[PDB]
Motif scaffolding. Structure first.
Motif, PDB file in Angstrom:
ATOM      1  N   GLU A 177      38.543  27.668  -3.923  1.00 44.88           N
ATOM      2  CA  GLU A 177      39.495  27.883  -2.839  1.00 44.88           C
ATOM      3  C   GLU A 177      38.809  28.117  -1.494  1.00 44.88           C
ATOM      4  O   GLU A 177      38.407  29.238  -1.179  1.00 44.88           O
ATOM      5  N   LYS A 178      38.690  27.056  -0.703  1.00 43.93           N
ATOM      6  CA  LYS A 178      38.121  27.155   0.635  1.00 43.93           C
ATOM      7  C   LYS A 178      39.146  26.700   1.662  1.00 43.93           C
ATOM      8  O   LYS A 178      40.118  26.023   1.320  1.00 43.93           O
ATOM      9  N   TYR A 179      38.923  27.083   2.917  1.00 47.15           N
ATOM     10  CA  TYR A 179      39.808  26.719   4.019  1.00 47.15           C
ATOM     11  C   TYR A 179      41.259  27.148   3.794  1.00 47.15           C
ATOM     12  O   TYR A 179      42.183  26.412   4.135  1.00 47.15           O
ATOM     13  N   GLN A 180      41.447  28.343   3.234  1.00 42.34           N
ATOM     14  CA  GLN A 180      42.771  28.878   2.904  1.00 42.34           C
ATOM     15  C   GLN A 180      43.435  29.621   4.054  1.00 42.34           C
ATOM     16  O   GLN A 180      44.655  29.767   4.083  1.00 42.34           O
ATOM     17  N   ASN A 181      42.626  30.113   4.986  1.00 42.06           N
ATOM     18  CA  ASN A 181      43.108  31.030   6.007  1.00 42.06           C
ATOM     19  C   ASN A 181      43.106  30.370   7.387  1.00 42.06           C
ATOM     20  O   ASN A 181      42.141  30.496   8.144  1.00 42.06           O
ATOM     21  N   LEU A 182      44.189  29.668   7.710  1.00 45.28           N
ATOM     22  CA  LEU A 182      44.222  28.837   8.914  1.00 45.28           C
ATOM     23  C   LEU A 182      44.845  29.575  10.099  1.00 45.28           C
ATOM     24  O   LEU A 182      45.852  30.281   9.949  1.00 45.28           O
ATOM     25  N   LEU A 183      44.249  29.397  11.273  1.00 43.35           N
ATOM     26  CA  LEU A 183      44.810  29.913  12.507  1.00 43.35           C
ATOM     27  C   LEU A 183      45.304  28.748  13.349  1.00 43.35           C
ATOM     28  O   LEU A 183      44.545  27.818  13.661  1.00 43.35           O
ATOM     29  N   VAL A 184      46.580  28.808  13.698  1.00 40.78           N
ATOM     30  CA  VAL A 184      47.212  27.839  14.578  1.00 40.78           C
ATOM     31  C   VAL A 184      47.481  28.492  15.927  1.00 40.78           C
ATOM     32  O   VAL A 184      48.187  29.503  16.012  1.00 40.78           O
ATOM     33  N   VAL A 185      46.914  27.913  16.976  1.00 43.73           N
ATOM     34  CA  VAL A 185      47.198  28.366  18.332  1.00 43.73           C
ATOM     35  C   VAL A 185      48.440  27.643  18.822  1.00 43.73           C
ATOM     36  O   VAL A 185      48.410  26.439  19.060  1.00 43.73           O
ATOM     37  N   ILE A 186      49.532  28.394  18.957  1.00 44.89           N
ATOM     38  CA  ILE A 186      50.807  27.851  19.387  1.00 44.89           C
ATOM     39  C   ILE A 186      50.728  27.487  20.866  1.00 44.89           C
ATOM     40  O   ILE A 186      50.116  28.205  21.660  1.00 44.89           O
ATOM     41  N   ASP A 187      51.326  26.361  21.225  1.00 43.76           N
ATOM     42  CA  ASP A 187      51.414  25.953  22.618  1.00 43.76           C
ATOM     43  C   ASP A 187      52.746  26.448  23.191  1.00 43.76           C
ATOM     44  O   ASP A 187      53.808  26.010  22.757  1.00 43.76           O
ATOM     45  N   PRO A 188      52.693  27.357  24.175  1.00 37.74           N
ATOM     46  CA  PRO A 188      53.941  27.962  24.665  1.00 37.74           C
ATOM     47  C   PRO A 188      54.758  27.026  25.546  1.00 37.74           C
ATOM     48  O   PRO A 188      55.896  27.346  25.878  1.00 37.74           O
ATOM     49  N   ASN A 189      54.187  25.891  25.923  1.00 42.30           N
ATOM     50  CA  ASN A 189      54.815  25.039  26.928  1.00 42.30           C
ATOM     51  C   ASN A 189      55.800  23.999  26.401  1.00 42.30           C
ATOM     52  O   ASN A 189      56.446  23.304  27.185  1.00 42.30           O
ATOM     53  N   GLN A 190      55.928  23.889  25.084  1.00 47.46           N
ATOM     54  CA  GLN A 190      56.902  22.966  24.506  1.00 47.46           C
ATOM     55  C   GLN A 190      57.333  23.469  23.146  1.00 47.46           C
ATOM     56  O   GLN A 190      56.660  24.310  22.563  1.00 47.46           O
ATOM     57  N   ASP A 191      58.445  22.950  22.642  1.00 47.59           N
ATOM     58  CA  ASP A 191      58.971  23.388  21.350  1.00 47.59           C
ATOM     59  C   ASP A 191      58.138  22.882  20.176  1.00 47.59           C
ATOM     60  O   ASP A 191      57.611  23.668  19.388  1.00 47.59           O
ATOM     61  N   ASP A 192      58.031  21.564  20.055  1.00 49.84           N
ATOM     62  CA  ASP A 192      57.307  20.963  18.942  1.00 49.84           C
ATOM     63  C   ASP A 192      55.829  21.370  18.926  1.00 49.84           C
ATOM     64  O   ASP A 192      55.168  21.396  19.965  1.00 49.84           O
ATOM     65  N   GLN A 193      55.314  21.664  17.734  1.00 51.87           N
ATOM     66  CA  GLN A 193      53.965  22.208  17.587  1.00 51.87           C
ATOM     67  C   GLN A 193      53.112  21.332  16.668  1.00 51.87           C
ATOM     68  O   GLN A 193      53.038  21.573  15.463  1.00 51.87           O
ATOM     69  N   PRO A 194      52.462  20.301  17.231  1.00 48.64           N
ATOM     70  CA  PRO A 194      51.636  19.430  16.386  1.00 48.64           C
ATOM     71  C   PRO A 194      50.519  20.184  15.643  1.00 48.64           C
ATOM     72  O   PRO A 194      50.136  19.766  14.557  1.00 48.64           O
ATOM     73  N   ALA A 195      50.012  21.274  16.212  1.00 46.29           N
ATOM     74  CA  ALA A 195      49.005  22.078  15.516  1.00 46.29           C
ATOM     75  C   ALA A 195      49.574  22.740  14.270  1.00 46.29           C
ATOM     76  O   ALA A 195      48.895  22.817  13.251  1.00 46.29           O
TER      77      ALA A 195
END
Lengths: 306, 306
Positions: free
Chosen positions: A1-19
């Motif tokens: 089990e690797k890469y389990q703990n993901l951080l997504v930086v939300i973009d405040p400038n639009q609704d949809d979040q490709p990240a």
């Protein structure tokens, strides 16, 4: 089990979040959890004469309330689909610092953030540049466009510089790429790429016996030997390795396009002495002209400024 | 005789030099001289095992020779027209450092550098961001497009923050703008602009008697009083002053467009404590969305990191 703990930086400038979407894609295939993270603030908090601490704190809580609910609205379908998404909105007036502290404190495996592409090249904000330069964890800049069908995964290795730490970083890049790519894709199409520039002169006025063309041939030769060593260690076929002549900041983005890359994987350093200075300059110009996703990885023993 | 000693940062990636052209335009009208400056390097210089010091120095001199002649080729018509252009090409692997050292050592009055505009907003490289953040002298980012006919000159003042140093910087911005603009243009069209955001809440659950709308009115009121003081000190007509509601990083670029601005003049700080942190964040996002020239000015007593 690797890469389990993901951080997504939300973009405040639009609704949809490709990240967030990319993180969900990863978790569906590899398991784990996602922190949807956003540092927020408001001018009113610095208006310490006009407003009281209670008034400023009322506005602070209002912002955190509103932004937290808004993120949940965007995450709604993922959540009910059963993806673990922890929403974290915090009060902080210096986003790059807040974000990196979060990476360090919770030991996140990957930081994922969206970049716009209208040039064709990705658009990077000052925040993006701070994260690229200073975040100790791998940084995945996700372009806000569809992933190319049959898109390849291109690792850009530094086979020119003579210091031993470059080889270690190259190994780290490919080990991670092979591991992560096979966890996400059924049959990842991984390529290796290097680029070397030529001598800027034809003859040396002080050195009658010197032939600059032999330097060009030697640098190419050095790449060929090192590239073969890499491909054999990581079981990559010779036809998926590419040693190219030219300025890396021009050649690498161009060849990624030619190879239909979905992403390029690149090593970036923190150190700035000796050969690192020109290397960092080259790397920034390269990144600034990329037209696909970027996964930027730091060396083991990277010392974070924060 | 002010603004006589101009530094032009040459762009190595193309022949035409809009930064040089703008500097020439200034010198034709105001006198002075121009340093056309370019830090250069080559990978070979860091190949200290493969090449000897003599071989590396041969390549170094070849690059400096070639780049110096190339700049002269671009400057040819200006030179024979009698403009003083001193071409300085130096060996350096960290351009932002080289450039700022040059500004400090020769006490240049203005740094002038081109930025591309294909978004409509100016494209800023990592080098541009370093100069904007760290150069002690005013930095003029010249977009590579024609200057708008009857283009205005817009000064963006900070009338919100409560610390006394903001007023000093505002005065410095407008004093410089009035002085420089009248040296260059026959009849400069100078406008003053501020923007204030509103409270993020409607009511405070802990504070029954508080009305956030009164805060909005007060912040506007504060701007109105300060704006009148500025316009009277600098003889700007009331109809050319604008106090606008909204987020500065959105409002300022939008209003500059509406006012047909050729340039926006903005104060940027080096300090990062207290109210400076959110201010610096706002400023970067504002700059990142500008669609005309930018003239960024630091406070007196700015402490340069270099």
């Amino acid at each position: 089990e690797k890469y389990q703990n993901l951080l997504v930086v939300i973009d405040p400038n639009q609704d949809d979040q490709p990240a967030l979407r990319r993180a969900v894609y990863i978790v569906q295939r590899n398991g784990g959890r996602i922190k949807a993270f956003l540092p927020v603030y408001d001018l009113s908090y610095d208006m310490t004469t006009l407003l009281s601490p209670d008034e400023r704190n009322a506005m602070r809580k209002g912002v955190i309330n509103q932004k937290t609910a808004w993120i949940k609205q965007q995450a709604r379908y993922y959540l009910e689909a059963g993806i673990q998404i922890d929403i974290k909105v915090i009060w902080h007036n210096r986003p790059y610092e807040a974000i990196i502290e979060e990476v360090i404190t919770d030991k996140h495996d990957l930081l994922i953030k969206m970049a716009h592409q209208h040039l064709g090249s990705l658009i990077f904000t000052p925040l993006d540049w701070q994260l690229l330069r200073k975040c100790p964890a791998p940084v995945w800049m996700v372009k806000d466009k569809e992933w190319p069908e049959y898109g390849t995964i291109v690792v850009a290795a530094n086979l020119s510089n003579e210091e031993s730490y470059h080889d270690a970083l190259n190994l780290k890049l490919i080990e991670l790429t092979n591991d992560l790519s096979h966890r996400i894709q059924k049959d990842p199409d991984v390529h290796l790429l290097s680029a070397y520039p030529v001598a800027p002169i034809n003859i040396a006025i002080e050195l009658p016996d010197f032939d600059p063309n032999l330097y060009n041939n030697a640098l190419r030769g050095q790449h060929l030997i090192a590239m073969k060593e890499l491909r054999q260690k990581f079981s990559i076929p010779e036809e998926k390795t590419h040693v190219k002549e030219g300025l890396p900041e021009q050649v690498i983005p161009q060849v990624c396009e030619e190879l239909n890359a979905g992403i390029v994987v690149l090593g970036i350093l923190g150190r700035t002495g000796l050969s690192a200075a020109f290397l960092g300059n080259t790397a920034e110009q390269l990144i600034d002209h990329i037209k696909c996703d970027l996964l930027a990885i730091k060396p083991d023993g990277f010392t974070c400024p924060i």
